[PDB]
């Protein structure tokens, strides 16, 4: 039905726009990345900042807290997926484009994408591209890993989303329902379906196009897409100064998430689904419900 | 829990240290074509650490990417200004400069960021128009009717007026035109002064003085 929720804890303390953020296996700990170049690890429940590490490069387009929690990946505009050690460890090089997103398959390997159409899979202790993914034609903007790390899809600027398998390294099928840049991707928690945010002011859901969301008043595209714990809801950040809540199954708007002084950058969701944090360009990380 | 409390207190200690060093530093974006000698203006990221009058400036050059630049450009909205560099000598790509500047001006996020316009090859433009091998009116018939060595100045002000008209066709962010070359070492002062003006206007908006 209709869902409303308000800010619970404001994780103030960042100096620049919170451009990307990520949660660990334990939802209590979160990693927040901002363009100021400072990866602060926040304790969600107590608002404590457990760790506050600095960064080699100020621009950080993605941050990956490993499921084991030992290391953090700081992928930015620099062509390096820097990995820091807790309780700097490696300098991965070889990508020819900006690190749009990074995701940890397990402790010792990382899967990344570049501004160039190439996506790569690394091994951390050796820093070598075990697998290469080079089927796209536009810039890859985001990734999405299923509960099983075997498959991942890479939304590109050419209005095409190609699903990849880590072992084979070759694309098997392509979706081109959208008509503009796809800057947000997130697998639906169940099955192979996944959502795609686009600059055409329209969000669509794809599975092996079958759904679309657009109103006349909405003239701004999507900026981040994520689901709930069960996937019934679809929280999609928007370019306009407030977030918007959609329904995966229904075309109508479930509700709105206003309270941000700028655009939403990343709309992270805790793995357990007990909280939602929407990093915005207002240098604040408001946690809702 | 006291250990967590004291660790946190230390954390915001170095965080306020970082906050004051961060506010002490200003970020910049350097843009231009390959033939545009933006590296001369400077003299993953071609990071630059330069300071004037005891304030730290960080001018970031993005040369490690490909032609598609409409997505990573959004990461630079927080910068005080964008150093836009145009190599106006090759009139074939000058229309590209106009289109790129027009895209920057009308972008959803960049309507708040003032842009510093640098015309980079004014010596080369002067030599080219003196030679007259390629006619400016051929690349733009509007120069056959536009009115203000007189000819080099006329061409320079026409090419700047194209960008200025594109900018003014749509307050808020402003566009500062400038003429630069390789031999000019004062570009840092121009950037610093224009960033000072931009920050002053941001303060006027912020302090309810408007």
């Amino acid at each position, epitope marked *: 039905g209709r869902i409303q929720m308000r800010t619970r804890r404001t994780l103030r303390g960042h100096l620049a726009k919170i451009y990307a953020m990520h949660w660990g296996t334990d939802s209590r700990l979160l990693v927040s990345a901002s363009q100021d170049g400072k990866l602060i690890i926040w304790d969600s429940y107590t608002t404590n900042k457990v760790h506050a590490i600095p960064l080699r490069s100020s621009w950080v387009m993605t941050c990956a807290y490993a499921p084991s929690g030992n290391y953090v990946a700081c992928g930015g505009l620099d062509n390096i997926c820097s990995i820091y050690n807790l309780k700097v460890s490696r300098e991965l090089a070889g990508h020819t484009g900006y690190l749009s997103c990074c995701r940890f398959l397990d402790d010792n390997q990382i899967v990344t994408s570049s501004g160039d159409t190439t996506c790569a899979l690394w091994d951390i202790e050796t820093g070598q591209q075990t697998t290469t993914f080079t089927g796209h034609t*536009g810039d890859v903007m985001s990734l999405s890993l299923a509960p099983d790390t075997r498959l991942f899809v890479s939304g590109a600027c050419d209005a095409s989303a190609k699903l990849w398998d880590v072992r084979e390294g070759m694309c098997r099928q392509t979706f081109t329902g959208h*008509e*503009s840049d796809i800057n947000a991707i997130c697998f639906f928690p169940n099955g192979n379906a996944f959502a795609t945010g686009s600059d055409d002011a329209t969000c669509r859901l794809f599975d092996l196009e079958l759904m679309t969301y657009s109103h006349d008043n909405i003239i701004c595209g999507i900026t981040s897409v994520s689901f709930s714990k069960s996937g019934r809801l679809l929280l999609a950040g928007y370019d306009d100064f407030n977030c918007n809540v959609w329904d995966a199954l229904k075309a109508d708007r479930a509700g709105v998430l206003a309270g941000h002084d700028n655009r939403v950058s990343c709309l992270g969701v805790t793995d357990d689904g007990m909280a939602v944090a929407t990093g915005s360009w207002d240098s604040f990380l408001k946690i809702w419900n | 829990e006291k250990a967590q409390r004291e660790a946190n207190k230390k954390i915001e200690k170095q965080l306020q240290k970082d906050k004051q060093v961060y506010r002490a530093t200003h970020r910049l974006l350097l843009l231009g074509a390959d033939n545009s000698g933006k590296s001369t203006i400077v003299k993953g990221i071609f990071e630059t650490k330069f300071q004037v009058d005891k304030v730290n400036f960080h001018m970031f050059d993005v040369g490690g990417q490909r032609d598609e630049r*409409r997505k990573w450009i959004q990461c630079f909205n927080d910068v005080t200004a964008i150093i836009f560099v145009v190599d106006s000598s090759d009139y074939n790509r000058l229309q590209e400069a106009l289109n790129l500047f*027009k895209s920057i001006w009308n972008n959803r996020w960049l309507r708040t960021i003032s842009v510093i316009l640098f015309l980079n090859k004014q010596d080369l433009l002067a030599e080219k128009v003196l030679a007259g091998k390629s006619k400016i009116e*051929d690349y*733009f018939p509007e120069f056959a009717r536009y009115t203000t060595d007189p000819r080099v100045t006329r061409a320079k002000y026409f090419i700047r007026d194209e960008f200025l008209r594109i900018s003014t066709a749509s307050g808020r962010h402003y566009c500062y035109p400038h003429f630069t070359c390789a031999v000019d070492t004062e570009n840092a002062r121009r950037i610093f002064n224009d960033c000072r003006d931009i920050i002053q206007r941001m303060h006027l908006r912020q302090y309810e003085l408007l």
Partner: nanobody
């Protein structure tokens, strides 16, 4: 699946017609590119605010019809290009290489 077709080409005036489908033609603006891969001219959303490349202002003429775009020859490949912005007049990567939202081209001489 976004896809574009064009009609025309051949020895020389010619009707450079763009066949577009799969997306709302009204929302996005259009551009013309010659091959360099240089931009030529554009038509705003309402068919006004027309701007031309200087070496095109006199010789050539453009128009828009509501899913088709028309240009009239008074010498290279002419892809039919559009912009990714649906409701705003910024447009970045038409001149870019391997840009998807572009035509297949007609050879005119």
């Amino acid at each position: 699946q976004v896809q574009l077709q064009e009609s025309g080409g051949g020895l020389v005036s010619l009707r450079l017609s763009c066949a577009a489908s799969g997306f709302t033609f009204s929302n996005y603006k259009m551009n013309w590119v010659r091959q360099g891969l240089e931009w030529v001219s554009d038509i705003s959303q309402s068919g006004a605010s027309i701007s031309y490349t200087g070496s095109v202002k006199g010789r050539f003429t453009i128009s828009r019809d509501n899913n088709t775009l028309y240009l009239q020859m008074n010498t290279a490949v002419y892809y039919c290009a559009r912009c990714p912005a649906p409701f705003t007049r910024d447009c970045f990567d038409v001149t870019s290489t391997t840009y998807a939202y572009r035509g297949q081209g007609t050879q005119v001489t």
